[model samples]
Target chain A: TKSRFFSDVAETSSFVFAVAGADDEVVLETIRLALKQKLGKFLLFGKKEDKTLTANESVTWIQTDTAEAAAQGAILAVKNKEADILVKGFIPTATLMHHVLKKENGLRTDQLLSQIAIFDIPTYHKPLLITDCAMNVAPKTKEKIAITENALAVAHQIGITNPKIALLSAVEEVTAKMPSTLEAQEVVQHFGNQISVSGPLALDVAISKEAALHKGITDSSAGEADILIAPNIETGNALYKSLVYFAGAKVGSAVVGAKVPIVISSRNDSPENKLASFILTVRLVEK
Target chain B: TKSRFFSDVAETSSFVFAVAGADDEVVLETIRLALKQKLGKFLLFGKKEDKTLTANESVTWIQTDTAEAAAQGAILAVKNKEADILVKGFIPTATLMHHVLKKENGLRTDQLLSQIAIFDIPTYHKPLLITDCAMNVAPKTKEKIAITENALAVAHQIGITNPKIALLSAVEEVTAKMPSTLEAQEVVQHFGNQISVSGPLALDVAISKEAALHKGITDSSAGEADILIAPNIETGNALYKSLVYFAGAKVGSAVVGAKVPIVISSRNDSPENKLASFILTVRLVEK
Candidate 1:
């Protein structure tokens, strides 16, 4: 059973982005497809003589000397309410993050910046959301809470009204010795009734109804988790890429929190791969 | 490519075991099939008059007062060299582990009793071995070192003479932020040349030649890992079950580092699963 929400592209009634545009195949094709699909209008941030700028005449070009300057310029566009989303092209991630994380930048929010990798797994019943796979390496308990909230906000912004959240660990039982298990238990206790939450659950118990039943776990989130809160970045990242590599999973990634959704995906990614991330950001804008 | 070794039962010769023979279907059927396949010869260590013990009468009987006693009696058989392998019947796991971990018992080695779950994944090229998935919940740096050695020992015993060991992590880069990445780096540095080792790799890079090539990681262990030493139990266990639940992987697990391989599988597991673990022990015995 595939997720219906991800493929429903029409509800995302389009948005404009300040793109630090690049001529890279994935970045160029992504913007081209989005523009063709009527899901995007853009404010391009790059040098005026950039060859990539010649083909895209419909976009409002913001001339910048370097990719670093372009990143800063894109952030400024969002800060000045010139664009709704902050899209990244082939700019160095450090350069893009430099402007976003700067205290002087109005885009900085009290919320922690986190990453969410959404997958529409063929074997899974619904869209599976995994957060902070990148960006946050080893988050503390406070950071974990903020990451969960960021994912929750994304879920709310997208179509999932009440996402079943599974605080994923190695095992279902909260063994005191395993910090992730205890951390999962704490997160569930703190946010239990506020959302449909189950915690300290193994990957199997979190996703498989049969597996959850075998373990005697009956929570709604036990078998059908929409959002899987990974113990840390390593667990999250491993799981995220494993699904893509081994399970034939289709995944999209977006950096959430701050003022807007950020799409800075891999250069090797196909246009559809980039489109998946754009779909997520556009849906959030629609909300 | 599927692992031919797992399915090739012809290489396995007949073996003897002292089983705390239980009346449960999985245990009973596993033994029954093993006997039929000439894979096992058994010394029944339960009561002759026990109602649950009404199976084929082709084995020697060693009557004991209780299941706990039966477990001890089976271990005694192994210690006496009367039986080559110690098989756990429908006995309590604690009862079996108590005897195995007992300091007084000669079966106790100067090593940690860790779990190695071997998988024949449909997507992967060869049998994948994951260690400390069940035992050693949150191993320290030293314990991880020991666990890797134990898995290496098992790999050596089970064929794969020069195993390509992948020190599994979220990313191939050794970052100071994530402990697992640092831990992977340390492990690789510690036991690198002694065995073929590459580390701090995500599952994709660890297993996929394409992924490794994409990342410019040309190490032999990058794309072809015989053993994947997990950073912690959370990472190990999640990866262990995810292969089964998501990838339709056939897995067999055994507790290594004891005098003999121990099979203490879950009750929810099928007779075939019990057989798989039994197969692992049998193959190790052959080695």
Candidate 2:
């Protein structure tokens, strides 16, 4: 993998973006600010009247019509090697993802495409990573393995060579009746020696090394884990928001399995966070 | 089925206790305290030590040479209509349980003698119930169902006419890769409806009705659950302790499944907790 990740913001070089549904002002304003910052090269996929790409020598913009056309165009742009990344601008994710996942010209990987939401949790001593929280519903074991791989990629990129991945359940030990905890144990026991894995740990123990130590847990992967693997989307999604609402944590998200990293910014995400995600994605993908 | 559970706690004037190891002083102290508090009557099994019986008055004590023999004596007491409940004392739990499961003893409800441990969680709005924490290691699907049924019986003794049972897992939803989560959903969807059952719920969500409702969970039994069905012993054990250690909650535990309620309090527990367990056992076993 060629280095796509830029450590220093000042060192960021020119890059192409295929922006879909460039109509909405919120979308236009975001790109406009990026353009002013000379963040990247631009290619708009909507009507010229819909985009507010200001005249700047550093910024170049293009035009299409509707969100559907933009979606179709963005996928083609990525597939035909015309774009480094597919950016959704005011386009519903379904429209963009549908086109991107099409077998014909979509961003389909032989592996599953999972969403990775990274967090710098204040309560935790280390950075936190969660996966498929927004996208996958109930991924199978193989997919969870992929989810693990996805989180590992992010962790490794963040300078953690052997990241601790906690397979979280309500409880930290395996019971025959509690399938998730048991699966967690199986996953960890099967791969624990091979990789840095701990759990079936509850959410708290996975992060607090002291908790693990107090509980007679000798697994190094537990306590101060880098990635927390949730059993399902319900837990993963709720936990993601709960960290924001309850734990006062900073969350950044990216989509992987595509050739390029796509920053999945939310409407409510702060501009700085979007920039953080964008930068993180660039670094991770480039690596 | 026949009514093996004693609801009134006061009706059955005389009670039976099958002691696995009468040699254990700590278990004896708990039993002595229970008797002093009017918990239940006991039939001891250990070497004929007059000093041990001198510790308590008006007691029916039996003698046995070894822990395994004491276990068989305890099981036989239950089988011969001598004792109502079986207390796993100074002996290894597996030893006592093995004798009870012998076909001739008429104690094996099915194939296994699963255990259920309950707690009085003040942190939560209700008395939280947990099962298979200190017992079964890796129960099969059939065994989990049996565990569920046994917990249900214990819940029926409490005020909960229809206790909401959460088939707990790592997350609130089922996943394909995580066998427990999948099984949780299936079990709740299938065998757990009448008692208001939901599976794959975390400890907090299951015990905290407010938390469950806040998550928009309106239908599942566990949202305001009286009983929590963990997938395995470790999950249950750690969670029960977490409530005590991390959450600052008090606890009371007992073994259920045989013809009576069994009391085996650990010395490490608080003395107040010791008394509480006595009260709970007598209250539960009261005919």
Candidate 3:
């Protein structure tokens, strides 16, 4: 069944989340909340011990000398089937991702790792997924296909079996002057028959039917798009931030395409957003 | 003398707006609204005459054979000093801009014609200006400088003498992988002592002081930026649409760097936004 709120999708479960550099107060608070909900247990790798972790039987702490060691320990825990998910905490995203990307870590897949942010925007009809906001600075057409696939997988897990995707650009017209528009068209062509997708759509046209009709865009997914494939990182990041700051949107994000779902919540993410990411990661873990 | 709302800035004035292909109902409504407020008179060029124009003595209807003829007639009107501002109506932007960009018409200037949108977001502390959203796709470093200058001019006209500009990017760090971040740094360096400008800032860091502190960005413009210089058209356009659609923001926009301010309100723009554009164009005109 389809779920609207992250709370609806979050069920009482025994998923184990291995957090690297987990000494951060904000990260621990989210874990504490998750434990209260019975959504998951935790394996925290950090330099110091927190009182909350000490009292919880489900919590396991592995003391590490440095943040890099914590990242390595967490990754090894996931590799050894001790943890079902990997969460980034106080350490920089690059440090955690570096070990995850290592070929010997067994987490790296042939697919490109990309960030997918799911927003529960008040104005939008349902949950909207925007991709590559955090990772993939400037993805080429091939990388865009992989990013789209990653988002598509998340959409399926969220109960959107056949999601409508819009490849966002500055304008809907396929002009050579704007390489993004051309790339959008190519991405749309690549997903023909396999999925319902359209491209070279502006943000307004992608979300508002009035805008789409006014612009004379007759694409099936012109208005009610479930996924927005950003042309570049700047576009994706700006869109994500605007929704959060201006729209009062609740968001859950993950770095996809790894063997296990990875949560890399930003420092600015709200407490609710951080917990939502944990829930989203647990949902992505296949039983 | 600073005004928070567009209505506060819109005063009784006698500026004449020359509209190309002015047969659109929405355009006529905006013109009627402007006339009611005594903000401007209208010099409309179109194939047909509307009852609203015929009834209003301040409105002059010029007969035209086609959309291109209407565009040329409007441009000529502006060039001959018959109209103080140019407004795009039913004609395509390229057609109207084609005549305005012609050297013989004398509307084109040495500066790049960039679009600047001023948004009064409910969440933001003050009016925020986002530039190059509708024009200048994928601008390089030099074009970005010109775009910033155009936005600066608008900010000054709107009562902000020394605006804080934030060059938007996916990240604050100037990495070689992200060209936008590097260009933002260059733009910041270009305006050393003239303006309070910083760059390579994510949207959250640019607008939220809390986010800035969390990310450790100590720039003066961080968290309280008056102007957001978008790295590219996709970023700008997406930011603009997201604010309008999700944020419940009131916006006024114009194409700057031309001899006369040009109003190119989008088809999906609300009536309030269209009227705000007229008021903004009139404000841009010098006495």
Q: Name the top TM-score candidate.
A: 3
Model 1, position A138, has a per-residue lDDT of: 69
User: What are the chain A TM-scores for all the models, listed individually?
Assistant: 0.91, 0.86, 0.96
Question: DockQ of every model listed?
Answer: 0.51, 0.05, 0.83
Q: What is the interface RMSD of each candidate, in Å?
A: 1.9, 7.5, 0.8
lDDT of 2 by residue, A1-287 (tens): 21222233542646666677666655666566566666676667776653235366654555677778888886787677776766777777778888777887757878678888777654555566777666776665677787787777677766766777888675654665567776776666656577777777776577666566645677666666778787665457546644553355566688887766675665545555566565566556562
What is the per-residue lDDT of model 3 for residues B138-188, given as tens digits with 9 covering 90 to 100?
898999999999989888876876888999999988999999999999998
Task: Give me the candidate number with maximum lDDT.
Answer: 3
10 residues in a row with least lDDT, candidate 3 chain B: B1-10
For candidate 2, write residues B49-109 as lDDT tens digits.
5465545664677778888889888888877877776777777656876776677877765
Task: Compose the digit string of candidate 1's lDDT tens values, residues B1-287.
Answer: 45644685433445667786554554667777676666767776874433443355546767776887888888888777777677778777668889877777788889988888888888887888888777787676788888889988888888876888887777777777678888788887888588788787887778887778756777566778888888777778778767777777778888888887777776545566567787888877742
lDDT of each: 0.76, 0.65, 0.88
Model 3 interface CAPRI class:
high
Candidate 1 structure quality by residue, lDDT tens digits, A137-199: 767667788889999998888767799888878766677767888878888777869888778
User: RMSD for each model, in Å, please?
Assistant: 3.2, 9.2, 2.1
Indicate whether candidate 1 or candidate 2 has the larger DockQ. Answer: 1
What lDDT is reached at residue B213 by model 2? Answer: 64
| Candidate 1 displacement at residue A25 in angstroms | 4.0
Of 1 and 3, the candidate ahead on DockQ is 3
Task: For candidate 2, give the docking quality class from DockQ.
Answer: incorrect
**Highest-scoring model, DockQ:** 3
